[PDB]
């Protein structure tokens, strides 16, 4: 019962959120070519 955490718990969440919306825009095109041989033969690599 404390709205003081709204500055701590929340707010700062947007800092990591905007950071997360940077690497995801790069891995997308990366997976738009690493899906053929990745899904073929075997896997393990992308399983992580």
């Amino acid at each position: 019962l404390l709205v003081r955490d709204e500055f701590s718990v929340l707010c700062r969440d947007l800092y990591a959120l905007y950071p997360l919306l940077i690497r995801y825009v790069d891995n997308n095109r990366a997976h738009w070519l690493t899906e053929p041989n990745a899904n073929a033969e075997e896997l393990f690599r992308m399983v992580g």
């Binding site: 899906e35 053929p36 899904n39 073929a40």
Partner: protein, 49 residues
């Protein structure tokens, strides 16, 4: 050939997944042939007197 990447991991099966013979097919011939006039032909009306 491709399938795999699309298909299996979203729920799809080929058309003739389990059959013991090839699927028959049709086509348009071209050669005209006579046939009775359908009474729903936009602009053609025939009747008996």
């Amino acid at each position: 050939r491709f399938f795999a990447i699309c298909g299996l991991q979203e729920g799809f099966e080929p058309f003739a997944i389990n059959m013991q013979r090839p699927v028959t097919t049709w086509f348009s011939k071209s050669l005209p042939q006579f046939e009775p006039v359908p009474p729903e032909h936009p602009h053609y009306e025939v009747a008996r007197m």
